[PDB]
Single-chain antibody
Framework: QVQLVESGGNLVQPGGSLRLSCAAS????????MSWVRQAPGGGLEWVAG????????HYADSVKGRFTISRDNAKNSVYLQMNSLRVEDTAVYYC????????????????????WGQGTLVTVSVLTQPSSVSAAPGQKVTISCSGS????????VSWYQQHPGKAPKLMIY???KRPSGVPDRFSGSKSGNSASLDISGLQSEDEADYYC???????????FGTGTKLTV
């Protein structure tokens, strides 16, 4: 039913340009805020650009301002990212993702979480702290901490994302402690002061993946991802 489908991943020479599309189906895209999130080789999740829901208001990460243009095409029910003056450090898989309805309104920054994710497309140009890794046997309990300061985790609600390598991230926990439909109750989320926790009881082999926390930061005025934790069973 509801999905986002990306297209346009290509190889470009340095200084070249490329346009990516993010097409919605099953819902009106303009009804939601949305973002582009990139992942460099060996890197974590990085917010790059986005649109506010009911306006056409844009913003961009500092590393990308002046070179990337985000726009909506309401006629095609889609969003585009025009990438000019591309650099080698721009090489990454780029995802688009919508922000939930419930985080697209007056308290959208407090709640900011992304429920529907694009497939990811590869462009080749040629301080939320988590443990590096955690491990346990199947059936064992695991805890993944996510630490910050007042501006991020202190003020805003935390979400958690599961990513098998090279695949689209998946929302596992939102608004600190909530699970979306279908996410098993083995997963639970916690917050206390400037730290949050993802607990996984009864480790299953399919849980082996990278896990990122995320929260809005009030001083940056930017959505932050954690450095990420590799979980092995």
């Amino acid at each position: 039913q509801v999905q986002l489908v990306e297209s346009g991943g290509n190889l470009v020479q340095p200084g070249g340009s490329l346009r990516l599309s993010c097409a919605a189906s099953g819902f009106t895209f303009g009804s939601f805020s949305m973002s582009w999130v990139r992942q460099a080789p060996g890197g974590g999740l990085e917010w790059v650009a986005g649109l506010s829901a009911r306006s056409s208001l844009t913003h961009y990460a500092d590393s990308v301002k002046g070179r990337f243009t985000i726009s909506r095409d309401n006629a095609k029910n889609s969003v585009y990212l025009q990438m000019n003056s591309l650099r080698v450090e721009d090489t990454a898989v780029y995802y688009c993702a919508r922000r939930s309805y419930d985080s697209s309104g007056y308290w959208g920054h407090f709640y900011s979480y992304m429920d529907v994710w694009g497939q990811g497309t590869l462009v080749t140009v040629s301080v939320l702290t988590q443990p590096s890794s955690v491990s346990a046997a199947p059936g064992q309990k695991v805890t993944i901490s996510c630490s910050g300061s007042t501006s991020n985790i202190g003020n805003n609600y935390v979400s958690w994302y599961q990513q098998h390598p090279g695949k689209a991230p998946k929302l596992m926990i939102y608004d600190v402690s909530k699970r979306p439909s279908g996410v098993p109750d083995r997963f639970s989320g916690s917050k206390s002061g400037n730290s949050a926790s993802l607990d996984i009881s009864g480790l299953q082999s399919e849980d082996e993946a990278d896990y990122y926390c995320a929260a809005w930061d009030d001083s940056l005025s930017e959505f932050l991802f954690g450095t990420g934790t590799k979980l092995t069973v």
